[PDB]
Amino acid sequence: MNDIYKAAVEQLTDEQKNEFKAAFDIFIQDAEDGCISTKELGKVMRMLGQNPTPEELQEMIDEVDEDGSGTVDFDEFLVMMVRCMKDDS
Protein backbone atom coordinates (compact mmCIF):
# COMPACT_ATOMS: atom_id res chain seq x y z
CA MET A 1 0.00 0.00 0.00
CA ASN A 2 1.77 3.12 -1.30
CA ASP A 3 -1.35 5.32 -1.22
CA ILE A 4 -0.11 7.06 1.96
CA TYR A 5 2.44 9.07 -0.07
CA LYS A 6 -0.35 10.48 -2.27
CA ALA A 7 -2.91 10.69 0.56
CA ALA A 8 -0.66 13.08 2.52
CA VAL A 9 0.08 15.32 -0.47
CA GLU A 10 -3.68 15.39 -1.16
CA GLN A 11 -4.45 16.69 2.36
CA LEU A 12 -1.17 18.40 3.32
CA THR A 13 -0.89 21.79 5.04
CA ASP A 14 -0.02 25.18 3.58
CA GLU A 15 3.11 25.20 5.77
CA GLN A 16 4.40 22.24 3.73
CA LYS A 17 3.62 24.00 0.43
CA ASN A 18 5.73 26.95 1.68
CA GLU A 19 8.43 25.10 3.67
CA PHE A 20 9.87 23.35 0.60
CA LYS A 21 8.69 26.02 -1.87
CA ALA A 22 10.98 28.51 -0.07
CA ALA A 23 14.12 26.50 -0.88
CA PHE A 24 12.52 25.40 -4.16
CA ASP A 25 12.23 29.05 -5.29
CA ILE A 26 15.85 29.97 -4.43
CA PHE A 27 17.22 26.80 -6.09
CA ILE A 28 14.85 27.12 -9.08
CA GLN A 29 15.64 30.84 -9.47
CA ASP A 30 17.88 30.62 -12.55
CA ALA A 31 15.91 27.57 -13.81
CA GLU A 32 12.85 27.70 -16.07
CA ASP A 33 11.64 24.08 -15.91
CA GLY A 34 10.01 23.78 -12.47
CA CYS A 35 12.52 21.59 -10.62
CA ILE A 36 15.58 22.00 -8.39
CA SER A 37 19.02 20.47 -8.96
CA THR A 38 19.28 17.08 -7.21
CA LYS A 39 23.08 17.42 -7.25
CA GLU A 40 22.64 20.79 -5.48
CA LEU A 41 20.21 19.31 -2.91
CA GLY A 42 23.07 19.43 -0.37
CA LYS A 43 22.14 23.09 0.21
CA VAL A 44 18.50 22.00 0.64
CA MET A 45 19.14 19.33 3.27
CA ARG A 46 21.31 21.80 5.22
CA MET A 47 18.38 24.24 5.18
CA LEU A 48 15.92 21.47 6.12
CA GLY A 49 18.07 20.54 9.15
CA GLN A 50 20.47 17.83 7.87
CA ASN A 51 24.11 17.97 6.72
CA PRO A 52 24.82 14.73 4.76
CA THR A 53 27.38 13.98 2.02
CA PRO A 54 27.14 14.31 -1.82
CA GLU A 55 27.18 10.51 -2.18
CA GLU A 56 24.54 10.01 0.55
CA LEU A 57 22.22 12.88 -0.44
CA GLN A 58 22.21 11.66 -4.06
CA GLU A 59 20.94 8.25 -2.92
CA MET A 60 17.87 9.63 -1.11
CA ILE A 61 17.21 11.91 -4.10
CA ASP A 62 17.22 9.09 -6.67
CA GLU A 63 14.96 7.14 -4.29
CA VAL A 64 12.32 9.90 -4.02
CA ASP A 65 12.77 10.82 -7.71
CA GLU A 66 10.35 8.43 -9.45
CA ASP A 67 11.83 9.36 -12.85
CA GLY A 68 15.37 10.16 -11.67
CA SER A 69 15.87 13.06 -14.09
CA GLY A 70 18.48 14.67 -11.79
CA THR A 71 15.88 17.27 -10.76
CA VAL A 72 13.45 17.43 -7.84
CA ASP A 73 9.99 18.76 -8.68
CA PHE A 74 7.74 20.35 -6.05
CA ASP A 75 5.78 17.07 -5.96
CA GLU A 76 9.00 15.08 -5.42
CA PHE A 77 10.18 17.79 -2.99
CA LEU A 78 7.16 17.55 -0.66
CA VAL A 79 7.10 13.75 -1.09
CA MET A 80 10.55 13.47 0.53
CA MET A 81 8.91 14.90 3.69
CA VAL A 82 6.23 12.20 4.01
CA ARG A 83 8.79 9.61 2.80
CA CYS A 84 10.87 10.32 5.92
CA MET A 85 7.88 10.46 8.29
CA LYS A 86 6.30 7.23 7.00
CA ASP A 87 7.49 4.65 4.46
CA ASP A 88 8.88 1.58 6.28
CA SER A 89 7.50 1.61 9.84
Ligand SMILES: [Ca+2]
Ligand atom coordinates in the same frame (compact mmCIF):
# COMPACT_ATOMS: atom_id res chain seq x y z
CA1 LIG B 1 12.45 13.94 -11.35
